[PDB]
């Protein structure tokens, strides 16, 4: 959408969760900078009225801030000239049975926005946990249309944010832990008419492939693989849901996202590469036809769900300025691809302790597996890095284009894993593995790291007590901001990683910070309200360390530091 793209370049706005179509999460605002961030104070605050995990962040457009919640996914608008009053509210009526099919809390990664045009007035879009996509008037809150995307009776929910491109809103999927076969859907923003739907497994017509799919990298695989890398009909319940983030290059007219893990977690029940789960896609925006598809983790054994964000940049590769995507995967590798051809430029370990893979052969594009760290029936595999929670999860990260550095909150969590046989029954959990998780060999659960994605060179690395889950915001004031699971917001100098500021929020953070200028002054905002996968133990009062898909034991100390909460904090000088 060209007007959305233009609105994204104004520092008064934060028009999409990713900030802009390249997912830079980078602000040119410098009022707040490394030399005065120590003076940053709370300006004002709002309550969301709900508990549970608060993922994503507010949107800001045309002087209105929009806020969203976890289930039942209430939405509120706030005029920035009257921050105490709610301009409008929308309160969904959803079946509370939706909660029972969420694998890891009832998080919602947030709203999207389109400006007014021929389609009608400006709209806010909401994915509800119960599987509806809803279009709301951005200025009044009126419900304009509502369609059914996902069916909770099949274990199929929505958690990822909608994504606006041209006259379409993209809606993902969720429920691989319940054998949902993943699909992404484009809806026309005027009337909610389904325009195209692309599945992550199965026959080629369902995958929605360009006639020239992977023509530049035929060794990635081309046709028939959605069937031939499964045994029989196992692809029908095969996972590949896309609950994470997207990027878009308007010059190429291409949308980028990752498909999730194959189902069930029990690898021995689904022999084959299990294409096209765990795949970085480049799809034509108008038709949904894939031009490239690179499978990062063939025959997943670890739940390395391939849904993490896609950060676009232009950088020199062997002296030539090239359009790139960079993607820190759950599997602990940071991929950089040419975003026109799909060619692999680099794939390096985010932390050297990653051990399921020895390395990625960049010519063949294949990860060379270490059998000592495989999973398989009749075996309790120990000491696998990363755990299923990944060395990187749902946080949207940041890119300083002057430094050519990505700043990422990283997890340092390892696991044991033992599968078990189980039947598929629609609407029930279909996991099939028992996990225990614990810190990785360096001893702490999180890090923050700055790196060059082309060279793999780490500029700096700092430890964090807990996994850094919510992603980051970088600015031309030489700062990267992020929240922590133990309930701080923090700012570090992006040349060195030195800690410059921190503030104790009420609850742990699992979304990202935003910044915007309103009436000549720079503000930073963030959600506080812990939950999500790390917080499942405290959210649901679990004590078995293997519960919460293995998260409960790793995060058992988190409840000493944070309770649940739900607020929006806004800072300024």
């Amino acid at each position: 959408n060209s007007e959305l793209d233009r609105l994204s370049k104004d520092d008064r706005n934060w028009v999409m969760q990713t900030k802009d179509y390249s997912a830079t999460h980078f602000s040119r605002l410098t009022e707040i900078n490394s030399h005065n961030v120590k003076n940053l104070k709370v300006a004002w605050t709002l309550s969301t009225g709900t508990l549970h995990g608060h993922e994503g962040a507010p949107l800001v457009v045309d002087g209105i801030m929009y806020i969203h919640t976890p289930f039942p996914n209430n939405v509120y608008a706030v005029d920035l000239n009257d921050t105490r009053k709610m301009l409008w509210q929308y309160k969904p009526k959803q079946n509370p049975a939706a909660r029972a099919v969420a694998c890891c809390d009832v998080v919602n990664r947030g709203l999207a926005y389109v400006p007014a045009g021929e389609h009608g007035p400006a709209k806010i879009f909401l994915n509800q946990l119960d599987g509806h996509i809803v279009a709301l008037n951005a200025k009044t809150g009126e419900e304009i249309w509502k369609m059914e995307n996902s069916d909770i009776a099949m274990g199929s929910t929505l958690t990822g944010a909608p994504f606006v491109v041209k006259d379409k809103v993209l809606v993902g999927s969720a429920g691989a832990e319940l054998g949902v076969r993943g699909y992404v859907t484009a809806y026309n923003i005027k009337d909610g008419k389904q325009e195209w739907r692309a599945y992550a497994t199965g026959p080629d017509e369902d995958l929605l492939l360009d006639k020239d799919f992977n023509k530049d990298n035929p060794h990635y695989g081309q046709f028939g693989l959605g069937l031939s890398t499964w045994e029989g009909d196992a692809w029908k319940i095969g996972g590949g849901t896309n609950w994470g983030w997207y990027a878009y290059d308007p010059k190429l007219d291409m949308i980028y996202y990752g498909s999730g893990n194959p189902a069930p977690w029990n690898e021995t029940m689904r022999p084959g590469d299990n294409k096209w789960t765990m795949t970085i896609w480049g799809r034509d925006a108008d038709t949904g036809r894939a031009k490239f598809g690179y499978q990062k983790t063939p025959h997943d054994e670890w739940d390395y769900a391939g849904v993490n964000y896609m950060g676009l940049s232009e950088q020199e590769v062997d002296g030539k300025l090239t359009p790139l995507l960079t993607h820190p995967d759950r599997n602990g590798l940071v991929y950089t691809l040419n975003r026109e051809t799909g060619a692999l430029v680099n794939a390096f370990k985010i932390d050297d302790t990653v051990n399921w893979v020895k390395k990625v052969d960049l010519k063949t594009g294949l990860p060379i597996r270490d059998p000592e760290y495989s999973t398989r029936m009749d075996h309790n595999a120990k000491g696998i890095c990363p755990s299923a929670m990944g060395y990187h999860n749902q946080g949207i990260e940041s890119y300083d284009p002057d430094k050519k550095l990505f700043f990422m909150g990283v997890n340092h969590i390892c696991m044991d894993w033992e599968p078990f046989m189980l039947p598929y029954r629609a609407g029930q959990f279909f996991v099939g593995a028992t996990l225990n998780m614990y810190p990785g060999p360096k001893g702490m659960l999180g890090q923050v790291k700055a790196m060059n994605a082309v060279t793999g060179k780490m500029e700096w690395e700092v430890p964090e007590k807990f996994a850094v889950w919510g992603g980051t915001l970088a600015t031309a004031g030489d700062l990267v901001f992020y929240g922590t699971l133990d309930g701080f917001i923090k700012a570090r100098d992006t040349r060195t990683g030195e800690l410059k500021w921190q503030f104790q929020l009420p609850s742990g953070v699992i979304g990202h910070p935003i910044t915007y200028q309103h009436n000549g002054k720079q503000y930073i905002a963030i959600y506080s309200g812990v939950g999500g996968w790390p917080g499942v133990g405290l959210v649901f009062d679990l004590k078995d360390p293997t519960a919460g898909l293995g998260a409960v034991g790793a995060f058992r100390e988190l409840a000493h530091y944070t309770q649940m909460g739900g607020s929006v904090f806004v800072f300024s000088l």
Binding site: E143, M154, G221, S228, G232, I237, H299, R369
Partner: protein, 71 residues
Amino acid sequence: YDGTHCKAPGNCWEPKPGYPDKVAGSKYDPKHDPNELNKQAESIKAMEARNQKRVENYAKTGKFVYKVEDI
């Protein structure tokens, strides 16, 4: 099974030593019910059909109505 021995482009899967080339008939046979396997796809057809009704109604009347029984 190192992942590097490819039967065809994009197909490098091999059984791990001691495990079977195919699971049907093995002790790891998932034994899925074909009728269960088809339920998600039938649910998506029903949702697609309801959504199409809501779209047709909007085009007919100019007013959005969600509940298909009220159209």
